[PDB]
PDB file of C-alpha atoms (C1' of nucleotides) in Angstrom:
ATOM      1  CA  UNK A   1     -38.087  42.482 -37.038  1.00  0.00           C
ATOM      2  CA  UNK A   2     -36.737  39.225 -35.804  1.00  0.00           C
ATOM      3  CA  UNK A   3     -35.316  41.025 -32.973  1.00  0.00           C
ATOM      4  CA  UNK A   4     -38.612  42.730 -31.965  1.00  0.00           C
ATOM      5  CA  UNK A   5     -40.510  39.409 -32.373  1.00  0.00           C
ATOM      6  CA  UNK A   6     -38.208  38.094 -29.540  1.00  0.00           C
ATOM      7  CA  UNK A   7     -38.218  40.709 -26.627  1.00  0.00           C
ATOM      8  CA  UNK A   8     -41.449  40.157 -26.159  1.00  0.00           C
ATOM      9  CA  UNK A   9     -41.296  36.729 -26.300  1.00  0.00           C
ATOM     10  CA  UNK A  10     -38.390  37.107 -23.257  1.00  0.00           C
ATOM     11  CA  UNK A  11     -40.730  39.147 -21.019  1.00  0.00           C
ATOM     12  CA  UNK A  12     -43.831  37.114 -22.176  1.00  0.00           C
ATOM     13  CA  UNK A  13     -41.383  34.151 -20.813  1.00  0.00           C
ATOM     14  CA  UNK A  14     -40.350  35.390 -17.698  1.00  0.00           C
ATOM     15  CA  UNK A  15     -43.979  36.029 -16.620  1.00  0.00           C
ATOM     16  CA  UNK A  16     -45.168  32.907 -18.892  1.00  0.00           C
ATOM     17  CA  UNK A  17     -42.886  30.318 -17.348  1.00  0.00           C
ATOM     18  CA  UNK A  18     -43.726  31.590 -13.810  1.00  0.00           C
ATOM     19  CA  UNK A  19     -47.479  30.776 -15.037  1.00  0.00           C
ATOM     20  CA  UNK A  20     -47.359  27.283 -17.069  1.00  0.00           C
ATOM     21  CA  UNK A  21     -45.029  25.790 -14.085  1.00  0.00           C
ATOM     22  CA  UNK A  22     -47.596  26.283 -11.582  1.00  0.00           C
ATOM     23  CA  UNK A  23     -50.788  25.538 -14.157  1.00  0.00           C
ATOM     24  CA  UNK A  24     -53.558  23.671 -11.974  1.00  0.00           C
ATOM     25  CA  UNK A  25     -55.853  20.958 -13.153  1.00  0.00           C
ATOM     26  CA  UNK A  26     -58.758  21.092 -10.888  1.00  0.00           C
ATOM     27  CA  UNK A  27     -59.902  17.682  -9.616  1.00  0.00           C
ATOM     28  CA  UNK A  28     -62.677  16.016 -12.057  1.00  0.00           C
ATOM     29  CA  UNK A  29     -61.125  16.376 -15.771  1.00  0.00           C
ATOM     30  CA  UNK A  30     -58.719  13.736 -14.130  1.00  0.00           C
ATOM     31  CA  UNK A  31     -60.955  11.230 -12.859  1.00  0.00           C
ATOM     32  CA  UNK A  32     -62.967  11.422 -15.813  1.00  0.00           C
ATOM     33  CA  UNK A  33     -59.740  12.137 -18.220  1.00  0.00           C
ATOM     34  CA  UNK A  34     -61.180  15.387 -19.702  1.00  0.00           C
ATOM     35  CA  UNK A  35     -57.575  17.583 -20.320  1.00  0.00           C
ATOM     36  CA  UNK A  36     -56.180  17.654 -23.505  1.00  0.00           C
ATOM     37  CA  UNK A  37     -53.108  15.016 -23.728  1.00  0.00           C
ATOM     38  CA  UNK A  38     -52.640  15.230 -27.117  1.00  0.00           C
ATOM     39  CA  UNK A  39     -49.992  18.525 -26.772  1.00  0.00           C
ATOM     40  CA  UNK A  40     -48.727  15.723 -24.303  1.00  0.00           C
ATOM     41  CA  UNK A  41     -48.516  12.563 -25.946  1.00  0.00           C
ATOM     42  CA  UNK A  42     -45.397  14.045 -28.261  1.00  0.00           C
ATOM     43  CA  UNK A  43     -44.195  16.449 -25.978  1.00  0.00           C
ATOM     44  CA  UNK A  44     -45.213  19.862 -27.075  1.00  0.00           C
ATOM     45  CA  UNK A  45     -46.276  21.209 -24.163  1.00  0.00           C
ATOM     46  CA  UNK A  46     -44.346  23.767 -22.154  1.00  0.00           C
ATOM     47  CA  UNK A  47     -44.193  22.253 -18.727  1.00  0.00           C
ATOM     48  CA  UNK A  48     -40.331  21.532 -17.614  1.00  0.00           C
ATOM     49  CA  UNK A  49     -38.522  24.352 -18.717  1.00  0.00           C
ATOM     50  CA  UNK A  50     -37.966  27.721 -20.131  1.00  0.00           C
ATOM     51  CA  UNK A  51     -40.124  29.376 -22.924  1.00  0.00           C
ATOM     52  CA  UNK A  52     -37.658  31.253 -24.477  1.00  0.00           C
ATOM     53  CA  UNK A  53     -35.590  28.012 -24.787  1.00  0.00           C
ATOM     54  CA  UNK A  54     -38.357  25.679 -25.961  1.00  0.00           C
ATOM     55  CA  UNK A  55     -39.905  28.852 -28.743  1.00  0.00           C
ATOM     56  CA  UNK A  56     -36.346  28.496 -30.031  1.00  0.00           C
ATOM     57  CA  UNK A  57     -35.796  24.958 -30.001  1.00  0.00           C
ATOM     58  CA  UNK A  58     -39.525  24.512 -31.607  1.00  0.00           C
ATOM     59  CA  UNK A  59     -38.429  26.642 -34.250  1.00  0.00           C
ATOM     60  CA  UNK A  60     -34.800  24.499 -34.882  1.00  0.00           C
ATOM     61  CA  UNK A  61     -36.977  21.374 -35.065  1.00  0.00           C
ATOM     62  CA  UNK A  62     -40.102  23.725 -37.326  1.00  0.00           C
ATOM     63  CA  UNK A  63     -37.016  25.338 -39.454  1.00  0.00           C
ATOM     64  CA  UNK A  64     -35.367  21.413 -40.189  1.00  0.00           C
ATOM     65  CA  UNK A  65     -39.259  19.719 -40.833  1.00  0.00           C
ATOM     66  CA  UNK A  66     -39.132  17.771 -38.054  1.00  0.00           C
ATOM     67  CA  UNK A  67     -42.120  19.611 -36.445  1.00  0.00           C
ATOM     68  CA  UNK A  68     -45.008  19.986 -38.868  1.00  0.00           C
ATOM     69  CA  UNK A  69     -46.044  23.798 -39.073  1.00  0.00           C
ATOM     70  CA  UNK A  70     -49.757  23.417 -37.177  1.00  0.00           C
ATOM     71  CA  UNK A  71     -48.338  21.205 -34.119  1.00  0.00           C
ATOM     72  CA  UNK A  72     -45.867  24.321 -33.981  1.00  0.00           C
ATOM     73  CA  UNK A  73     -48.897  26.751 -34.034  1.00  0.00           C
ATOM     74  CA  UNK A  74     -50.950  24.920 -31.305  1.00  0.00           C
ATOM     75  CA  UNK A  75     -47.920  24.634 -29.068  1.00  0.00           C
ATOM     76  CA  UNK A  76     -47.521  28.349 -29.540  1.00  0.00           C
ATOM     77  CA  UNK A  77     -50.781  29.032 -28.848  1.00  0.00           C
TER      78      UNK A  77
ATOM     79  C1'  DC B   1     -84.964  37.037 -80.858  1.00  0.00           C
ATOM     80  C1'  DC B   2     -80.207  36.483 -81.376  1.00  0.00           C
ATOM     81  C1'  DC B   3     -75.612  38.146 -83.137  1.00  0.00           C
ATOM     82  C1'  DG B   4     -72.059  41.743 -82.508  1.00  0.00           C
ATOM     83  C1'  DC B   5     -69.388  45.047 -80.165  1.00  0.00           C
ATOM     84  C1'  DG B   6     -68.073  47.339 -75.948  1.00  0.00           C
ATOM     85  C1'  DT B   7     -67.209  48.510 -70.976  1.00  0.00           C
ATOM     86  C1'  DT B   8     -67.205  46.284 -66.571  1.00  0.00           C
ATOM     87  C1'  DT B   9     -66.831  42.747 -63.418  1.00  0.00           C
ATOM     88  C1'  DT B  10     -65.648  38.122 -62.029  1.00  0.00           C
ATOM     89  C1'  DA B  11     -63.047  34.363 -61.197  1.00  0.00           C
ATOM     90  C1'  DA B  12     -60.300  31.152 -63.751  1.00  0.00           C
ATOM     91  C1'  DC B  13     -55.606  30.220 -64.139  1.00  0.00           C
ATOM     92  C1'  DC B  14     -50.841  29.977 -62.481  1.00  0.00           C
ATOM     93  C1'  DG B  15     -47.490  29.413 -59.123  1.00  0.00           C
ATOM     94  C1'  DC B  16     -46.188  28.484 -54.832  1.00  0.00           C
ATOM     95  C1'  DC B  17     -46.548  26.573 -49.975  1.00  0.00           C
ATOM     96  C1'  DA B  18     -48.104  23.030 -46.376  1.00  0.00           C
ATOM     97  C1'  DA B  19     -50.362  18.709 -44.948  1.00  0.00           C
ATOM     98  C1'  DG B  20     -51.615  14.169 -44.915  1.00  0.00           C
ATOM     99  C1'  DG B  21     -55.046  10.672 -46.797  1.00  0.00           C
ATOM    100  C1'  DG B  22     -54.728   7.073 -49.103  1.00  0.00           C
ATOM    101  C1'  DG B  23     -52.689   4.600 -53.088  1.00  0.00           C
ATOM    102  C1'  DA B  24     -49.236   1.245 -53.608  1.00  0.00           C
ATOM    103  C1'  DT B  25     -46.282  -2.212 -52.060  1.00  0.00           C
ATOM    104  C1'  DT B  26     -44.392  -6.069 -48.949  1.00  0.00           C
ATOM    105  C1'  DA B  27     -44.598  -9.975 -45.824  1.00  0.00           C
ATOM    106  C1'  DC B  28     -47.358 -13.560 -43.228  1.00  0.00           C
ATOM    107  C1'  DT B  29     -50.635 -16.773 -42.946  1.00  0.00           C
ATOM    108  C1'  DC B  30     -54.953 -19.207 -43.576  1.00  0.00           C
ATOM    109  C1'  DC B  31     -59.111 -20.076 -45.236  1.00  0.00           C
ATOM    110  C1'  DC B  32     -61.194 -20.714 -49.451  1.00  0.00           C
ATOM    111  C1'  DT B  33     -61.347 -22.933 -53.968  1.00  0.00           C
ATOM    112  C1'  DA B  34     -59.655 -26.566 -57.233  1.00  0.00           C
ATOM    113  C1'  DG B  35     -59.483 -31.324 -57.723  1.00  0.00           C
ATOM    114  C1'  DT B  36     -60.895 -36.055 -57.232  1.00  0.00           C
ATOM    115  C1'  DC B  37     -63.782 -40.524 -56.113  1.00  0.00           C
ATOM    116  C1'  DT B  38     -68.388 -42.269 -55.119  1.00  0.00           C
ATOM    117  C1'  DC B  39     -73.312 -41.607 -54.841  1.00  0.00           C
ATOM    118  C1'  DC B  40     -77.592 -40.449 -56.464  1.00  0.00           C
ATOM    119  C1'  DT B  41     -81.475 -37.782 -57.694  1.00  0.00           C
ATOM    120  C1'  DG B  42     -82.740 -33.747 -60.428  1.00  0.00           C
ATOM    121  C1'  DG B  43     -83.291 -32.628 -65.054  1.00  0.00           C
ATOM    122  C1'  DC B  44     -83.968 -34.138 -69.807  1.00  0.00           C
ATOM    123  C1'  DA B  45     -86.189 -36.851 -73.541  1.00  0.00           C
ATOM    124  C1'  DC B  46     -90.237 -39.138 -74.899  1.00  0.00           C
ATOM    125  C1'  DG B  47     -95.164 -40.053 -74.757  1.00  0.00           C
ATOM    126  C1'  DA B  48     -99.836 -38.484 -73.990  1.00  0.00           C
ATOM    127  C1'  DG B  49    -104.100 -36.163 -72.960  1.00  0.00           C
ATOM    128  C1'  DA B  50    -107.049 -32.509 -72.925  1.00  0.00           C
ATOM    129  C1'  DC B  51    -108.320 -27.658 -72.639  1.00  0.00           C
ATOM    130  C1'  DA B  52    -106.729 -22.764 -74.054  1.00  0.00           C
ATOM    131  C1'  DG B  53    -107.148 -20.569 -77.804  1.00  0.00           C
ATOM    132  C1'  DA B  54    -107.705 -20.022 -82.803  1.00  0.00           C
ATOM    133  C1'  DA B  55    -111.420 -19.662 -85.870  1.00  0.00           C
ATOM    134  C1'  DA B  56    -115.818 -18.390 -87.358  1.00  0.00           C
ATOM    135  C1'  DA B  57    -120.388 -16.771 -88.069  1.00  0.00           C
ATOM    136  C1'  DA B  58    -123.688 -13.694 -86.457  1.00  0.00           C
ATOM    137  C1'  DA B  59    -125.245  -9.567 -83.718  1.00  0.00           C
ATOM    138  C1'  DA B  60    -124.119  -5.308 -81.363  1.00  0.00           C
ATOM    139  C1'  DC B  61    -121.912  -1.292 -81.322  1.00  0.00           C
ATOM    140  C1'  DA B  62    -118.886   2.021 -82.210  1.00  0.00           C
ATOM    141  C1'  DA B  63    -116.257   5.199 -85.194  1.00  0.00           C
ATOM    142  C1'  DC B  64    -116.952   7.998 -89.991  1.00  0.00           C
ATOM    143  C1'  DG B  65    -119.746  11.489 -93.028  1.00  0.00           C
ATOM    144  C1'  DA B  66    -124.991  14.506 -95.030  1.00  0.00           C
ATOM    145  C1'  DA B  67    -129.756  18.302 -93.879  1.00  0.00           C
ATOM    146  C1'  DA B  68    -132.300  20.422 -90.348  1.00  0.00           C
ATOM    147  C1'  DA B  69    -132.437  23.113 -86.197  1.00  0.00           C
ATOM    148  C1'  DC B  70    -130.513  26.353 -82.904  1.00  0.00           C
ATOM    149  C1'  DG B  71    -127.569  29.958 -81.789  1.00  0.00           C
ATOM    150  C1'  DG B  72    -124.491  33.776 -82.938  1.00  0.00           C
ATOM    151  C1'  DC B  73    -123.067  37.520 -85.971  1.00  0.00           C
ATOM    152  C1'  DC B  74    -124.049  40.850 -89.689  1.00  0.00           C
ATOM    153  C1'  DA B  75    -127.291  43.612 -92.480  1.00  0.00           C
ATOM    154  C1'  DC B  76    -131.693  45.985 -93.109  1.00  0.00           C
ATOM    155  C1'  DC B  77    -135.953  48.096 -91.446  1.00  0.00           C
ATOM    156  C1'  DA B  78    -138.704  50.339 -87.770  1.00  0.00           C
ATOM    157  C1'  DC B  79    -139.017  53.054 -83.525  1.00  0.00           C
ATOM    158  C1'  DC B  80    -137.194  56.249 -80.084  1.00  0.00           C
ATOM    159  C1'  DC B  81    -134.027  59.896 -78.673  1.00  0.00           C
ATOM    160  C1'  DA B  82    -131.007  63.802 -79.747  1.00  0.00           C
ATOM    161  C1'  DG B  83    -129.603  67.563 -82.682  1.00  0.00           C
ATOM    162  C1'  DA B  84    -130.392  71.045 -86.314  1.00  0.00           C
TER     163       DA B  84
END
DNA sequence: CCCGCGTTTTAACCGCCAAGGGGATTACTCCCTAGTCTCCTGGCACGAGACAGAAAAAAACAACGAAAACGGCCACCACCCAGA
């Protein structure tokens, strides 16, 4: 089951990382600061790396309780 | 109408997990309250005077209790209709 749960993560994050390191703002939400920093602000979101590094490094930090289990969820989501 | 007993359904209860709001505490600092001296004017005691109200007597009126009249219901008699 485990197993499962992460091959699809690994194709998911070959085509996934290709996506979130070129994700585009647009020009306007900037100017007018209408993106979502929070994700930001303590460093959950994907941008600078791998995803099937930063799933499994999520989950160290999730399995230890030093990420709370929603912030996890978002991140994932 | 409510108690009693019985199926049938509901959700309370338990227990277990996850999250964080807010109780509780600590440290810093200041602004508020206690305290005190001097000043005085608001509140209290006393005196007074007069009018609001108690009283009162008398009249008006406004609740309590009998016989006649009117209306409604029941019984009896008369008239009309239906049946024998």
């Amino acid at each position: 089951t485990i197993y499962e749960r992460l091959l699809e993560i690994k194709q998911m994050n070959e085509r996934v990382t290709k996506e979130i390191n070129t994700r585009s703002t647009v020009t306007f939400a900037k100017d007018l600061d209408l993106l979502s920093s929070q994700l930001s602000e303590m460093g959950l979101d994907f941008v600078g790396e791998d995803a099937y590094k930063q799933v499994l490094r999520l989950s160290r930090r999730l399995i230890n309780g030093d990420l709370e289990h929603q912030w996890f969820e978002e991140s994932l989501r």
